[PDB]
# Entry
Amino acid sequence: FFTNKIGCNVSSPLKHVDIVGEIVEEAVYNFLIDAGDKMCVGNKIGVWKVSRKSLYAKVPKGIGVTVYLANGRVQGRLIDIGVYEVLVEEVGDIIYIHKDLVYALCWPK
Amino acid sequence: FFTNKIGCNVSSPLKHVDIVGEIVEEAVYNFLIDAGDKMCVGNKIGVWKVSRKSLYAKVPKGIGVTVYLANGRVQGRLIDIGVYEVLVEEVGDIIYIHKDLVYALCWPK
Amino acid sequence: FFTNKIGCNVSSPLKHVDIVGEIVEEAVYNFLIDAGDKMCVGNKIGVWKVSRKSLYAKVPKGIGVTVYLANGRVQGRLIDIGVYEVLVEEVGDIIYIHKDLVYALCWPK
# Structure
């Protein structure tokens, strides 16, 4: 579906997921959204409105990120993105989130 | 589990998912529910009460459908069902939902 | 990620998932948590705070379990754990939950 949607506007219709931007690049598992003051990696496992394996290498390590889930969000310092998981520091603790639950991961430009 | 449950009554115990019907057919990834005034394709990735690869070919294109998610629902005109995704028109916009998040997709008979 | 976290404290940061314990064993798809008065199998598909294929063989059949989902919980008598699914009796009815939606499954010691 996303293959030929580069340049399309895209938004999350989930009320708690404040993402409205443009699709800039697309990868097998996820796609990159330019949201103006922030970028996001949007998961193909997701609910998206529209109007090379992964792009997570784009997310800056050490930066404060917002990981959106289907039912909430995790905000903290990005530690690492592994093969299956995103690790974010909240307080002095590591929050692990499996990638299949990461609906979107945004960071400021 | 669903292999030998044809003829069983089945319901969604999620409060916002108003599905109560009978299992009529079963496929590798999903099963078909006759709910009287509506049919549904129920995802094997789901929470179900009970008391050939896919059945999504049964859903009429162009019809108004209700896509139930774990935490809400998407209602609009069915555009297409692809290999990985369901596309529904809400307003004049395409809502994409990955199949793994489609808990059930119902349409009126 | 979990490979070398045996002995780490682990908790669910989801408000409705009251799990705080220690990682005792780890398997390809899930890991075992000792929570003092209860044990849990935690899914690697999950959100976890930290500070051989599966361990579901540890859960006693017939026991009252609590199956935590991303947005709620199912409590009843464990019937079976199959390859893809957990079956729990609530009332005199079978509740099926696909394993990918089982965030954690706890039982009392």
Summary: Chain A is about 0% helix and 50% strand. The beta strands of chain A are 9-11, 20-26, 30-34, 38-43, 47-50, 64-68, 73-81, 85-90, 93-98, 104-108. Chain A has one domain: 8-109. Residues 28 and 53 of chain A are 5 Å apart (CA to CA).
